[PDB]
Amino acid sequence: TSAVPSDNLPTYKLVVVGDGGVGKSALTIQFFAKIFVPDYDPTIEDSYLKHTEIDNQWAILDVLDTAGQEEFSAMREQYMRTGDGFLIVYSVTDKASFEHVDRFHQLILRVKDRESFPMILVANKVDLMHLRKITREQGKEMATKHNIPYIETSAKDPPLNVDKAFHDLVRVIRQQ
């Protein structure tokens, strides 16, 4: 690991939410283990911990890989209350994932009962433009709709903003 100096490091409970098959797990495995997972293992609720320095400021990252099969429509109230930041993730090759973006937005905003909360919209699977069904402008418009930063990632072997998406969400929390 990486032994951090000082003590009592800030801990950010980053929660990754999104529909099934979007890529929430593969993005998280890439950020923590630097490896792309191609298989189909639907996630119920897994957690990941790591110590990294962001903008010359160490911090503890507790990332929660939520479910997507909707079979576990519960458990949402739990991580949507203790989470310090959220990563709305949709797939550019699955139109159904794009309509559910504001479905998660009103959930997080109501459960938090705030005017707004640190969120970042993630357009995943941009390595498959031959089957892409959501343009970049469609994601930009949805991002400006809820006043949310936007980023395009792809958990494939080419990295593509996997670390930046998490690190930006840590940056949003520090300046929210």
């Binding site: 490896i35 997972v37 119920i44 897994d46 911990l49």
Partner: protein
């Protein structure tokens, strides 16, 4: 002898409170023959802990805390998604106790080893393994790790269905998720110390009854220390008079002398094996009043008939003057020699008189042989279904005895048949031994009835104990352990089959052995049983293994709490609570107290470890007799996933045995309702008496009394208190848990007739679970309704309600009570048998069979099921001034 045995002898004496040297001085040949003949029970138990040494030692220290039946109730299975539970596996990732998690969804009926197999599948996703490669890593690691509950020291060491473990099934019923973790077998096996049991130094050292042609005659001589008066005698076979009681002459107290033989209406050869003499010194002024009682077995532990002169130190009469004799009392001389004595002589014949061996009994039974469906079957079925307190007319006693050969088709009628046999004769008792020799085994709950004071025959005890060795699971054994230890007092001798059964189980199950030790240690102050239990603890402590070191650390911990509470009540009693606190914090911050109260196992639950205690949370409660509110920290690495602070109430000055029994009955009633389909959530919190009116109370978290809730906010305050702590979506789940918990305690408190409920006797949790805590006195003090359900509770049950009643919410609450009431009524024999086994205890409200008759009234056992329901509906209507009419 061995200096290692001297070290062991000092630890055994510290745990039991008396040095082992005192047992070496007891000249009683039964005491010495017990200490040697009991050591093979220790050998056989140690041999079981060494058969397959890796796994068996682990199965002993951490026994699988599972339930009895692998199957689930239908309402429990419906709480599952396609019969699958979601478990949450945790793992430490950094040396700073940082933990990650990953959730599994597996069938409930799966082996823990299969849960580990699914865990490897979930973890090896970033490994990029093929289908054949996944099989290699599984079969290489599936079987080298063990599941452990996160928070406590509970493990999954056996191939039980996962839903059969109590923690898993408790999660299912409560709608929670199991929090488990993996641990390698070799890391758990390496922490298991080796047991080193060695045989102690003390391990190394006629005429038949049926040939005596005479009647029983006992001579009463004189009486000293008596300080007119006569002596009343009697021959009983465990509560049943064998012959009519005879009385001596009426002499004044000037020179207490009788010097007279008493002829009894009983043939000497016709005496049973369990025959006892019950005598007493009575006064007379008409006004017949007993002064002192005493009992003695007509046979000793070697089957020898009593003969010769003997003094019998009598026992003081307890509160209440019943019949002049006391057959139910203990037999034997009083250890305190200041009590009045009594000199007796038993008739000598020629040589030693022995009870005939079993082969001679067979000869007489075969000889006396030479000397159906329309109603005989149904009557035998109706006789068996009656409660053990119901009377059996003499006609039915002969009817059972005449059909004793057909009674083998319904072995549950055996308790009724044993009471029908005239034990005064020997031809019938000889035949009864042949039936019991080949009587079909019965259920363990039924065989416990054959172990109370009404069945003293050794062959009868042997049948009940054998029924326990086959059918009594370790789950049920720990449930009825308090009764099985009490009926050890009813045993005529030290060496019997029930004490060897309990000792072997306690020495092959540390969860059994833990409460086994504490139940015995609690009654060690009582000199009536201090020798029977003290000798039992010595054999246990000498073979329990490493757990003795843990017990000594628990004994010294409780000992320091007693000493502190004693000085608190004698030195700073009338002082203000502030002054008491300054005295408390000083006597606790000293090093000798901190080292004894930190780093030991919780007596309420040995799986819960008690690390360092948070002195700032320890306080003297504002209740009666100044209870100690103690708060330890959970030293488990994943303690946050279960509980972080362990809170225990140490109560000194009040007898907590009544609370133990009521809490044990509440737990049993809940298991009755649950397995039938009645989801009524009772809260039987922990409670363990550890001595003379000293005990521990388990603290339940997030619970508040009604008086506290009322001050934290007049009638609708309780209803608003739940809506604030339960959102609009959880509101329906909170009022549901409230109605189901009220229906349970409304029925439980009525049947048991507990103390009256008030705003400080009733507590409510944040989720809406209701329960009681006080439990002053059960049974008797127009039946008493302690839980009256005030209008504050009716508001919560019926939500927003104009009149609370005539509402479907209240109608569904009435249905929950009716179904729960008739459910407990269908198991009346069990609770009656559980109360019967407690009569030998010092329970002031469980001395006579008249107190046990209270539940016979509240259950309306003499009426039909339709009538017994209308009965319960009346006392609820009378106690509530309406709402239970429906006529």
């Amino acid at each position: 002898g061995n200096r290692e045995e001297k070290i062991l002898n000092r630890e055994i004496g510290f745990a039991i409170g008396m040095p082992v040297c005192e047992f070496d001085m007891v000249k009683d040949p039964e005491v010495q023959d017990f200490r040697r003949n009991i050591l093979n029970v220790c050998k056989e138990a140690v041999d079981l802990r060494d058969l397959n040494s890796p796994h068996s030692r682990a199965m002993y220290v951490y026994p699988p805390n599972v339930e009895s039946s692998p199957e689930l109730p239908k309402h429990i299975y419906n709480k599952l998604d396609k019969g699958q539970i979601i478990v949450v596996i945790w793992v430490i990732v950094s040396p700073n106790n940082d933990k990650q998690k990953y959730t599994l969804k597996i069938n409930h009926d799966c082996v823990p080893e299969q849960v580990i197999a699914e865990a490897i599948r979930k973890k090896t996703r970033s490994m990029l393994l093929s289908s054949e490669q996944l099989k290699l890593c599984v079969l290489e690691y599936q079987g080298k790790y063990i599941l452990k509950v996160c928070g406590c020291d509970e493990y999954f060491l056996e191939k039980y269905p996962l839903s059969q473990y109590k923690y898993i099934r408790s999660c299912i019923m409560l709608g929670r998720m199991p929090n488990l973790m993996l641990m390698a077998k070799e890391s758990l096996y390496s922490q298991l110390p080796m047991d080193c049991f060695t045989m102690p130094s003390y391990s190394r050292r006629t005429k038949s009854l049926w040939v005596i042609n005479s009647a029983l005659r006992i001579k009463i001589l004189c009486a000293t220390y008596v300080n007119k008066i006569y002596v009343r005698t009697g021959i009983y076979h465990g509560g049943e008079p064998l012959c009519d009681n005879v009385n001596t002459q009426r002499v004044p107290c000037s020179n207490p002398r009788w010097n007279e033989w008493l002829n009894y209406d009983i043939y000497i050869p016709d005496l049973p094996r369990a025959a006892r003499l019950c005598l007493s010194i009575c006064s007379v002024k008409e006004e017949h009043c007993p002064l002192a009682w005493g009992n003695i077995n007509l046979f000793d532990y070697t089957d020898t008939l009593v003969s010769g002169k003997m003094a019998l130190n009598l026992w003081p009469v307890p509160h209440g003057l019943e019949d002049l004799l006391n057959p139910i009392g203990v037999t034997g001389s009083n250890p305190n020699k200041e009590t009045p004595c009594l000199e007796l002589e038993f008739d000598w014949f020629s040589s030693v008189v022995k009870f005939p061996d079993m082969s001679v009994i067979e000869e007489h039974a075969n000889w006396s042989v030479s000397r159906l469906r329309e109603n005989d079957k149904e009557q035998l079925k109706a006789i068996s279904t009656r409660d053990p307190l119901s009377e059996i007319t003499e006609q039915e006693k002969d009817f059972l005895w005449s059909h004793r050969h057909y009674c083998v088709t319904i072995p549950e009628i055996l308790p009724k048949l044993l009471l029908s046999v005239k034990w005064n004769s020997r031809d019938e008792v000889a035949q009864m031994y042949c039936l019991v020799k080949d009587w079909p085994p019965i259920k363990p709950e039924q065989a416990m009835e054959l172990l109370d004071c009404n069945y003293p025959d050794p062959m009868v005890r042997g049948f009940a104990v054998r029924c326990l060795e086959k059918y009594l699971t370790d789950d049920k054994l720990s449930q009825y352990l308090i009764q099985l230890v009490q009926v050890l007092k009813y045993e005529q001798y030290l060496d019997n089959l029930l004490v060897r059964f309990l000792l072997k189980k306690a020495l092959t199950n540390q969860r059994i052995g833990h409460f086994f030790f504490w139940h015995l240690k609690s009654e060690m102050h009582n000199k009536t049983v201090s020798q029977r239990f003290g000798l039992l603890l010595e054999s246990y402590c000498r073979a329990c293994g490493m757990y003795l070191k843990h017990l000594n650390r628990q004994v010294e911990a409780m000992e320091k709490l007693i000493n502190l509470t004693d000085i608190l009540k004698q030195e700073k009693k009338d002082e203000t609570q502030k002054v008491q606190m300054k005295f408390l914090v000083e006597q606790m911050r000293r090093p000798d107290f901190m080292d004894a109260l930190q780093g030991f196992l919780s007596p309420l639950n040995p799986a819960h470890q008690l690390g360092n205690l948070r002195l700032e949370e320890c306080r003297i409660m504002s209740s009666a007799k100044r209870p100690l509110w103690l708060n330890w920290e959970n030293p488990d690495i994943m303690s946050e996933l279960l509980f972080q602070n362990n809170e225990i109430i140490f109560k000194n000055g009040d007898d907590l045995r009544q609370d133990m029994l009521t809490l044990q009955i509440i737990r049993i009633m809940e298991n009755i309702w649950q397995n039938q389909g009645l989801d009524l959530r009772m809260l039987p919190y922990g409670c363990l008496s550890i001595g003379d009116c000293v005990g521990l109370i388990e603290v339940v978290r997030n619970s508040h009394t009604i008086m506290q809730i009322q001050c934290k906010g007049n009638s609708h305050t309780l209803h608003q208190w739940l809506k604030d702590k339960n959102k609009g979506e959880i509101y329906d789940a909170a009022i549901d848990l409230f109605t189901r918990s009220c229906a349970g305690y409304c029925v439980a408190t009525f049947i048991l007739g507990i103390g009256d409920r008030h705003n400080s006797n009733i507590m409510v949790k944040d989720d809406g679970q209701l329960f009681h805590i006080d439990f002053g006195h059960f049974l008797d003090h127009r039946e008493r309704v302690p839980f009256v359900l005030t209008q504050d509770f009716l508001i919560v049950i019926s939500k927003g309600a104009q009149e609370c009643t005539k509402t479907r919410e209240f109608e569904r609450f009435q249905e929950m009570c009716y179904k729960a009431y008739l459910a407990i009524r269908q198991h009346a024999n069990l609770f009656i048998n559980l109360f019967s086994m407690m009569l030998g205890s010092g329970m002031p409200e469980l001395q006579s069979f008249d107190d046990i008759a209270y539940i016979r009234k509240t259950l309306a056992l003499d009426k039909t099921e339709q009538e017994a329901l209308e009965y319960f509906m009346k006392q609820m209507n009378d106690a509530h001034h309406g709402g239970w009419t429906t006529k």
